[PDB]
């Protein structure tokens, strides 16, 4: 939780301070990815640079698969705009 320190003195009024103490949980995996966070329309290649590490700094052999897609416009349908776009063209790649 977040413990709070309070201090009363002859001159000060409240010396408040905060904690952020957390449960000491160590998930055995940690994946590091840095997305570009912004992509322009006239681009053809989206590069992902992914790594993954154990708790104690060890490489992790395994399969890394990425699936990226979206929707098209979702106008609303029926008395709005019945048939619209696609299910979103979803692509998929996998690597080792």
């Amino acid at each position: 939780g977040s413990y709070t320190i309070t201090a009363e003195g002859e001159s000060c009024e409240s010396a408040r301070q905060g904690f952020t103490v957390d449960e000491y949980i160590l998930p055995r995996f940690s994946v590091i990815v840095d997305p570009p966070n912004t992509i322009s329309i006239l681009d053809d290649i989206l590069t992902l640079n992914v790594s993954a590490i154990y708790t104690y700094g060890q490489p992790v052999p395994g399969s890394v698969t990425i699936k990226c897609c979206r929707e098209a416009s979702s106008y609303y349908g029926r008395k709005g705009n019945c048939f619209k776009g696609n299910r979103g063209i979803c692509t998929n790649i996998t690597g080792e």
Binding site: D22, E23, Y24, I25, L26, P27
Partner: protein, 96 residues
């Protein structure tokens, strides 16, 4: 100048009349002044100094074109102070 409900402000200068025709070199001129301008009295009263100089520093204001505009307060400062200082971004405790 407003510190603890104390104005400390000297009274406004007398208001001139908007119909006294005055001659310059050419045509016949009436006086006027806009509500919002900038002068030495407003490059002070923002840093917070007090002047007592006799020399003219304050803008002259004509009747019918006073400050009005109720309380023209914009963002006024571009402050970067705050609290919370955290998004979700859970970087869980991952080291001994």
């Amino acid at each position: 100048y407003n510190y603890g409900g104390f104005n400390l402000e000297e009274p406004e200068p007398p208001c001139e009349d908007p119909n006294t025709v005055i001659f310059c070199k050419g045509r016949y001129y009436l006086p006027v002044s806009s509500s919002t301008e900038g002068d030495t009295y407003q490059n002070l009263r923002r840093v917070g100094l007090v002047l007592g100089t006799s020399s003219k520093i304050r803008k002259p204001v004509v009747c019918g074109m006073e400050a009005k505009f109720s309380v023209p307060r914009k963002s006024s400062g571009e402050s970067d102070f705050g609290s919370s200082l955290s998004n979700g971004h859970v970087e869980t405790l991952r080291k001994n």
